[PDB]
Design a protein around this ligand. Structure first.
Ligand code: ADP
Ligand code: ADP
Ligand code: CA
Ligand code: CA
Ligand code: MG
Ligand code: MG
Ligand code: W
Ligand code: W
Ligand code: W
Ligand code: W
Ligand code: W
Ligand code: W
Ligand code: W
Ligand code: W
Ligand code: W
Ligand code: W
Ligand code: W
Ligand code: W
Ligand code: W
Ligand code: W
Ligand code: W
Ligand code: W
Lengths: 413, 413
């Protein structure tokens, strides 16, 4: 029947509550960007694993105090020194080099004066130490940064470049992570042609498939292109069955209003036997947005049947689909970032919550960004926000330039 | 010699001023994410290309007024109607369907009552129109959204999903764009082992290469892994020559301070014959950061020789390298987004401007985010900002929790 109007808050919670978290797999750490760890990661070595110089200078005995010293040799990075530093002696050290036995502090070269070098001038022989070194000064002790057996990354961690670096550091080059969802995208309608086609009478080009696939790809998830499907229940069923076989998530657009050749809801329920959780949402745009799940064996497939209007499709994809994908790939709090911004122009409110693509810009020293709903130069930039306008009331019927509003971040700022 | 201390502002401007914009290439529109158009793009068709219904309803003659009408047929999406609507008649239409000849308005189904249908109930025969239609109501005229010959995207546009959708819409499936830079990354030092290696005496694992490659990959640029190179001028030269052959940009780390086995600056100048624009920057961390260019034939190569300390390397990569890469790939204003945030803890200022990775978080309804320099839960998130602290003065020697500071965005918020 005509599905109940579902509130935006209920629809959103329903998507998150009903979306599964995918299983795990082992990956190479270099492939970890944007992955969520499904294991704790432990250090199997100390960092540094030897006492290491913080400075270019000399390894000394602090008890020697300031004075003139014989340079017995050099500790070079990458090699364990063999000599022991005795009273009256020092060893040259470079940053990251091991501290030799017998030394207990480092004096940086700027707190020294060279006395004697070799004739060719390539070897230092004697040096004046000008300061009283503090015990342990300018040395990183064994384990100062990381200790053997320390947990350096917890399960649940959403990895960026520095986490990949940490895995490299501790030598943990394979890790268990959640899988990424595979997302299949289909367009529907007898009027649709491919982008590559010249127009024919009564027809237009399919843009949603491209826009949706790009949106998903921007977030790093693998995609499947299911093409254009006609307004025909058998064709829709066959396409959905392909999507279900090939992917974790199916996204369709078009054919979800109550029109005569809108078949998707019927096919989902009667033919595919999916559970439709909502089929209308009280929102602008996006009224006919539909969310269904299908359990086959012990696997839950998710299906988003988005409106056909191109603006509606991209808006609802960002509101509903992206957070579900984030939950599927193991992100613990998959909610989008919502920031406060100032309206750049007056806006009339609707009885429905309204959503509009916008561009966020910071002005000089002003603390809040401005939100400009999509000058010449502005066109050089792609939308990076979704303005989230409140429903109207007897009190508030309009918002004014400068008033503070919620904006969901949808692109790299 | 010991290079002059360059201010942060000068170093940053120097990088942008000396970095080239790469040439152009033709790509398929599906590959356009993050690319910058090097051509204006024009529509070769109207959108819609026929007069199109906005609603499910009936195509009517407004001059008929309200009343009872014979339904002569249906205009279905994807097909040009053949019948003409005469006085006293209407045609069913669906959203996106063409308006038949003879009709000049659409009345939505909710403003109608069905009078008669076929016995099987699959065909509507007569309908009551309850309203006086406004001329042209609920019709998108030819060219309403886009006109043939209109410029729909300007050169200089940095493309996201909606721009890809627009290309699909107008059927422009190949476009001229700036090339992306290819970025080669090398680590240096005799003490370094690969991540895959067990430790040996005096050695540590190479983490910078992984962190830097991931940082670059996060921005979408192709990379080349040049491996680990020893503290040896000949090996460094050979590696740099490989990077120059294989890539547009070379990033090294390590070996740029004035230590005894730090050879990079010498190799760059004497052996590679590159022009070093700065070799020290008055900043914390990142003092020894070095930027050079090399012109070969009519091609300018860029070389960033970053400090070896892992925190310094990732900070300077975000401050200097990423903006240069953005200029190379044709972004007109390649500067990073800097936002205002509140300090989550007291901080002492240094004579040098200081930079620290942080996490930005919005709290409930507070307009400004909090910046937390890198609770348990916080560790689940990767750094998304770089705190930019001002140099100290006689006046300001510390900043307090809650004070507003600049933060450069370095991850998806
Ligand atoms: N893939 C697409 N690309 C561009 N326009 C589309 C696409 N799919 C549908 N449309 C257009 O969106 C409008 C609404 O389509 P429709 O199928 O009625 O959406 P729904 O029934 O889901 O609300 C129509 O003008 C239709 O031509
Ligand atoms: N790739 C790397 N990974 C981890 N640590 C490194 C790496 N390269 C250098 N380091 C460490 O950074 C510190 C500084 O190295 P160094 O080569 O002296 O940097 P610079 O001379 O450029 O300031 C030393 O402790 C060194 O071991
Ligand atoms: Ca349709
Ligand atoms: Ca080194
Ligand atoms: Mg429809
Ligand atoms: Mg050094
Ligand atoms: W230091
Ligand atoms: W240092
Ligand atoms: W709408
Ligand atoms: W709507
Ligand atoms: W609509
Ligand atoms: W509407
Ligand atoms: W409307
Ligand atoms: W509506
Ligand atoms: W509408
Ligand atoms: W609609
Ligand atoms: W420092
Ligand atoms: W420093
Ligand atoms: W330092
Ligand atoms: W320092
Ligand atoms: W310091
Ligand atoms: W320093």
């Amino acid at each position: 029947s005509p599905f109940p109007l579902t509130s935006m808050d209920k629809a959103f919670i329903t998507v998150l509550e009903m979306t599964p978290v995918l299983g795990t797999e082992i990956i190479n750490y270099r492939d970890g960007m944007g992955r969520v760890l499904a294991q704790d990661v432990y250090a199997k070595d100390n960092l540094p694993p030897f006492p290491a110089s913080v400075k270019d200078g000399y390894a000394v005995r602090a008890a020697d105090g300031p004075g003139d010293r014989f340079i017995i040799g050099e500790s070079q990075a990458g090699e364990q020194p063999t000599q022991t530093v005795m009273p009256g002696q020092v060893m040259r050290v470079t940053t990251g080099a091991p501290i030799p036995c017998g030394a207990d502090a480092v004096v940086q070269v700027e707190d020294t004066e060279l006395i004697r070098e070799s004739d060719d001038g390539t070897e230092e022989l004697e040096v004046r130490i000008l300061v009283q070194a503090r015990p342990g000064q300018d040395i990183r002790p064994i384990g100062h940064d990381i200790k053997r057996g320390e947990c350096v990354l917890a399960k649940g961690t959403h990895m960026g470049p520095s986490e990949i670096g940490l895995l490299a550091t501790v030598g943990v080059t394979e890790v268990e992570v959640n899988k990424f969802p595979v997302v299949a995208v289909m367009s529907t309608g007898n009027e649709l042609l491919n982008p590559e086609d010249d127009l024919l009478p009564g027809k237009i080009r399919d843009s949603n498939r491209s826009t949706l696939l790009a949106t998903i790809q921007e977030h790093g998830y693998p995609t499947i292109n299911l093409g254009i499907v006609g307004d025909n229940p058998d064709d829709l069923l066959n396409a959905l069955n392909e999507g279900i076989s090939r992917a974790d998530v199916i996204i369709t657009s078009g054919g979800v209003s109550m029109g005569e050749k809108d078949y998707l809801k019927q096919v989902l329920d009667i033919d595919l036997h999916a559970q439709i959780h909502f089929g209308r949402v009280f929102m602008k745009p996006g009224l006919p947005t539909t969310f269904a799940t299908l359990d086959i064996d012990g696997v839950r497939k998710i299906i988003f049947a988005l409106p056909g209007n191109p603006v509606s499709a991209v808006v609802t994809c960002n509101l509903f689909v992206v957070p579900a994908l984030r939950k599927m790939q193991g992100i613990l709090d998959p909610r989008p970032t919502i920031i406060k911004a100032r309206l750049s122009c007056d806006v009339k409110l609707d009885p429905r919550p309204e959503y509009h693509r916008c561009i966020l810009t910071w002005h000089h020293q002003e603390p809040l960004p401005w939100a400009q709903s999509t000058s010449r130069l502005m066109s050089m930039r792609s939308a990076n926000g979704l303005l989230m306008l409140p429903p109207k009331t007897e009190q508030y019927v309009e918002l004014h330039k400068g008033e503070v509003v919620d904006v969901m971040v949808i692109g790299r700022l």
